[PDB]
């Protein structure tokens, strides 16, 4: 006979979803500014339309996205293997190989074959082909159903070949699907450990040992992936908010008056610009207002020089005596003004030059002759018990704000500073006023030394550890705490600062008013330095390195406050306990989740419908009644549903029965299916307007066998509502197979196909002694036994033949002794083919691939490569018919036992 698939079909294998990921350069010489590059491409095996998209980038023209160009690839005749994305291991499914005939008026007769694959259980075996001949009318298609059972997980391959009769046209498709284990994917949380190296762990490091995945529902021998998620937790180091600029709108003052009155109006405007420039609140305050106040600062410096005495000193009038405090305060305001506006520096250094020649006793004391007419501007220095030490600290701070600007001008400045610092240390431990210790606490922290005890007295004089307070007007205490903040920010201490700034903010002092010169200038110079130098966040910087015994390297991650790698995932397919070492500052979160295959119900099939399919031989060669009963599992009746009916090979439905079903009230069979020919009609869809949830809706129609076939593949019925194909239910029907399932032998989620023969079919007379030795001496033949059938345990799934090992002709990988028993398994379809009788003897050999259970309970399977030959008894050999066989068997044993197998 002719195998039409002899056409040497090279099946189509290339549904890439995308390709041609190429980069070309238009180097050809341009014609009218257009370069044309010709490019040879090899189209893939897909039968579809490709959309080719091109994007160009040019140095002189920029980016351009071309219009999509389409290429359609087609054949007249071709196979479309409708393969699902995934299939569960050992679950029986029906794939569809759709064959298309786009000939205009030629009806094709095609021979189509499903190729055998040991990874699947189908009608195709190693010794039998699943070939069939179908008819495809012109401009039509026919779906060829194939029933398979995947037997091993992974990417498995299905190949279908076809060749048409009387035309030299052939085609083949070779696609692949994923075989996923009977469980369902599930994820569990392994650990959630918070990382904080400065609160947990020791010596600055934190070691966290992670336990391996604690799964107990996992399907045996399945892959699991553990995902390590290192993620930094951002916080907002904490810093105290700046004062809202809306409360500071009243500090913009036009300076006027004499030498003391001009500085009163100049102070709130210089310190407001200084504080608003540092905090950058001009956007929320009015960017236009910045220049107007900048001119009022110039107006203050312009009118203050009118009262600068020719001796480089400052007094209220040009005829007034100079002051040590007023001169030192002009140095304090002009120094902080240089950063925004400047005109003359010899005015600032000229006042510092006079401040040391005339008002510096070698004791280091600054004494006030007091021509200060306005006692408002003095601040806490007024009404001070230790007015002598508080003034030495006030002038000393003024020299420092101008020290970096008058270092070369006034070369005697570091001498007076050291002398002023010497006087403060001596009588620092004798002060009893909180204002003196505060201003002289910033006067000795500024580029100076406060002794351990002096620092202790400075920190212990803070009542409630947050504020500096003393009997007197509160503007003295607000000024004092402002000096104590500039000291804590000069010493770079930040553990005592938060409660100090919080108190300053809760004071709600926004400057301005009568006698507020010192209080307004210091409270916003200190709060500006707090915003200038500050540790918005809490400084996240974690150096977390994980040491995994799964690899030979340690992966580390510097989790800065930088937003480049806030979280970084590390997948590790190996499930092993690893170590997480984390050190640094800040907080972080570690998440370890493992995905795995959890064993559950494979109960995921038929979760929305009940489906009962019965095939009965109720009475042109054969005629059976296919009955289908279905019921929806909801609280209400289901909507429009589909009955995807598949015919068993060789059968077609009765046309008159379908026309009567199509006339139903709640049923619809399309006119397309009713006009189809009787033959080449193996699929059918009966549409249901509704399917009840209370009772089973049953329909039935007769099916006729128009073509006799040796092997009948089970038909299938599939129910689903139109809006959800995933929620379906498929039942198989076949006269003479349990629930429509193909024959397979399963044990502990491991199945092997049982659609093979049954055994090696070579006749006992066509085999010779040399043919037995040549077959048995192959390395594939593991065991060669002489057995005696003891018991035949008949079962409906498979027959068990308990054999006593009469003689070990060739011992295999199974250490069995004479007298012991081994079970030989064969499906019930081979019960009549084997014809095994109890207490009879047999010669048996087979492959080591036919072993089944574990070594203590090892079972043998009688497959297509198992030799089973009747061994007649010694007395039976006296017949002339058995003479030939007994001479072979007796010689076969002596040749194997005494001399073995050469090579």
């Amino acid at each position, epitope marked *: 006979e002719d195998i039409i698939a*002899e*056409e*040497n079909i090279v099946s189509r294998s290339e549904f890439p979803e995308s390709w041609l990921w190429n980069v070309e350069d238009l180097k050809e010489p341009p014609k009218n500014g257009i370069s044309t590059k010709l490019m040879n491409i090899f189209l893939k095996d897909s039968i579809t339309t490709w959309e080719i998209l091109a994007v160009s980038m040019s140095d002189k023209k920029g980016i351009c996205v071309a219009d999509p160009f389409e290429v359609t690839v087609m054949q007249d005749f071709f196979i479309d293997l409708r393969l699902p994305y995934s299939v569960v291991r050992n679950e029986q499914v029906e794939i569809r190989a759709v064959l298309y005939n786009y*000939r205009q008026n*030629q009806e094709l007769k095609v021979r189509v074959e499903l190729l055998h694959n040991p990874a699947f259980c189908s009608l195709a075996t190693t010794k039998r082909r699943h070939q069939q001949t179908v008819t495809i009318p012109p401009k039509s298609s026919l779906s060829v159903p194939y029933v398979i059972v995947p037997l091993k997980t992974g990417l498995q391959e299905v190949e279908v070949k076809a060749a048409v009769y009387h035309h*030299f*046209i*052939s085609d083949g498709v070779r696609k692949s699907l994923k075989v996923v284990p009977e469980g369902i994917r599930m994820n569990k949380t392994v650990a959630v450990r918070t990382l904080d190296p400065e609160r947990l762990g020791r010596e600055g490091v934190q070691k966290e040992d992670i336990p391996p995945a604690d799964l107990s529902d996992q399907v045996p021998d399945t892959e699991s992936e553990t995902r390590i998620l290192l993620q930094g937790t951002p916080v907002a180091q904490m810093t105290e908010d700046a004062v809202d600029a809306e409360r500071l709108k009243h500090l913009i003052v036009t300076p006027s008056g004499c030498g003391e009155e001009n500085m009163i109006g100049m102070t709130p405007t210089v310190i407001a610009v200084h504080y608003l420039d540092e905090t950058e609140q001009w956007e929320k305050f009015g960017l236009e207002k910045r220049q107007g106040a900048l001119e009022l600062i110039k107006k203050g410096y312009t009118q203050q020089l009118a009262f600068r005495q020719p001796s480089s000193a400052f007094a209220a009038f040009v005829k007034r005596a100079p002051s040590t405090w007023l001169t030192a305060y002009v140095v304090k305001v002009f120094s902080l003004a240089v950063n925004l506006i400047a005109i003359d520096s010899q005015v600032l250094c000229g006042a510092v030059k006079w401040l040391i020649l005339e008002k510096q006793k070698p004791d280091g004391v600054f004494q006030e002759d007091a021509p200060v007419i306005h006692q408002e501007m003095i601040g806490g220095l007024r009404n001070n018990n230790e007015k002598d030490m508080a003034l030495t600290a006030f002038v000393l701070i003024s020299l420092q704000e101008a020290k970096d600007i008058c270092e070369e001008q006034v070369n005697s400045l570091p001498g007076s500073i050291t002398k002023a610092g010497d006087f403060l240390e001596a009588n620092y431990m004798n002060l009893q006023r909180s204002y003196t210790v505060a201003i002289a606490g910033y006067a000795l922290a500024q580029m100076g030394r406060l002794k351990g005890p002096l620092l202790n007295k400075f920190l212990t004089t803070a009542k409630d550890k947050n504020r500096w307070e003393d009997p007197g007007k509160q503007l003295y205490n607000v000024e004092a705490t402002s000096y104590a903040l500039l000291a804590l920010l000069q010493l770079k201490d930040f553990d005592f600062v938060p409660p100090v700034v919080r108190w300053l903010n809760e004071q709600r002092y926004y400057g301005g008013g009568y006698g507020s010169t010192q209080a307004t200038f210091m409270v916003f110079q200190a709060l500006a330095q707090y915003q200038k130098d500050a540790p918005d966040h809490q400084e996240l910087n974690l150096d977390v390195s994980l040491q995994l015994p799964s690899r030979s390297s340690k992966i580390t991650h510097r989790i800065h406050w930088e937003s480049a790698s806030l979280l970084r995932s590390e997948e590790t397919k190996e499930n092993e306990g690893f170590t997480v070492t984390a050190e640094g500052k800040g907080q972080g979160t570690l998440s370890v989740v493992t995905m795995y295959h959890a064993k559950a119900k494979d109960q995921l099939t038929c979760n929305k419908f009940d489906l009962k399919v019965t095939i009965k031989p109720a009475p042109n060669k054969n005629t059976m009644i296919l009955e289908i009963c279905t019921r929806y599992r909801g609280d209400q009746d289901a909507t429009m549903s589909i009955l995807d009916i598949s015919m068993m090979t060789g059968f077609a439905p009765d046309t008159d029965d379908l026309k009567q079903l199509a006339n139903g009230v709640d049923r619809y069979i399309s006119k397309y299916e009713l006009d189809k020919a009787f033959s080449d009609r193996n699929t059918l869809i009966i549409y249901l307007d509704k399917v009840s949830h209370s009772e089973d809706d049953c329909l039935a129609f007769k099916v006729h066998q128009y073509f006799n076939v040796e092997l009948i593949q089970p038909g299938a019925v599939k129910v689903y509502a139109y809006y959800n194909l995933e929620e379906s239910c498929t039942r198989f029907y076949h006269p003479e197979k349990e629930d429509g399932k193909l024959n397979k032998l399963c044990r502990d989620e491991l199945c092997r196909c049982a659609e093979e023969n049954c055994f090696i079919q070579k006749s006992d007379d066509k085999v010779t002694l040399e043919e037995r030795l040549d077959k048995a001496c192959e390395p594939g033949v593991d065991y060669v036994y002489k057995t005696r059938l003891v018991k035949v345990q008949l079962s409906n799934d498979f027959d068990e033949y308990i054999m006593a090992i009469e003689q070990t002709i060739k011992s295999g990988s199974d250490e069995v002794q004479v007298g012991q028993q081994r079970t030989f398994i064969s499906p019930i379809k081979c019960r009549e083919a084997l014809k095994l009788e109890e207490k009879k003897h047999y010669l048996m050999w087979g492959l080591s691939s036919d072993f089944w259970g574990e070594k203590p309970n090892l079972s043998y399977i009688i497959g297509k490569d198992t030799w089973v030959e009747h061994w007649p008894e010694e007395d039976e050999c006296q017949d002339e018919e058995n003479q030939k066989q007994c001479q072979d068997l007796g010689a076969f044993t002596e040749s194997m036992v005494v001399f073995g197998c050469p090579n």
Partner: nanobody, 123 residues
Framework: QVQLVETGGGLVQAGGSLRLSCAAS????????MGWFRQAPGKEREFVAT????????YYADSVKGRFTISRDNGKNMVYLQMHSLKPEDTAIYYC????????????????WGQGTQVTVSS
């Protein structure tokens, strides 16, 4: 496209034999049908033999059914037609043609033909 060149023809006696070689322009691979056609003087162009793409299937006309043998070499881009046991009724111009595979026994599915060669079998 692809064109063909026929060689191997000539003059022969009544009883003898000769084989005709067909040379292809491009790669003959992936071409399903390769057929030989002949046209006798005073007669119409008739079908002779087709060969499969891989060479595993052939079709012959009843007049030359058991006397001609078509073969192809896809690696050499060649088609052959071994003519044995000649008859004086086989005198014709022999054409080599490329086909699509559909209906390989008719000329309506051959779009690329050759020059042809004269094979005169004298009585």
């Amino acid at each position: 496209q692809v064109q063909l060149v026929e060689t191997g023809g000539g003059l022969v006696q009544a009883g003898g034999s000769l084989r005709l070689s067909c040379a292809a322009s491009g790669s003959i691979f992936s071409l399903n049908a390769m057929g030989w056609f002949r046209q006798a003087p005073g007669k119409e162009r008739e079908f002779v033999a087709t060969i499969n793409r891989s060479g595993g299937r052939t079709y012959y006309a009843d007049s030359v059914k058991g006397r001609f043998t078509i073969s192809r070499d896809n690696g050499k881009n060649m088609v052959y037609l071994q003519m044995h046991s000649l008859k004086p009724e086989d005198t014709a111009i022999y054409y080599c043609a490329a086909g699509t595979g559909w209906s390989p026994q008719t000329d309506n599915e051959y779009n690329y033909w050759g020059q042809g060669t004269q094979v005169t079998v004298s009585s």
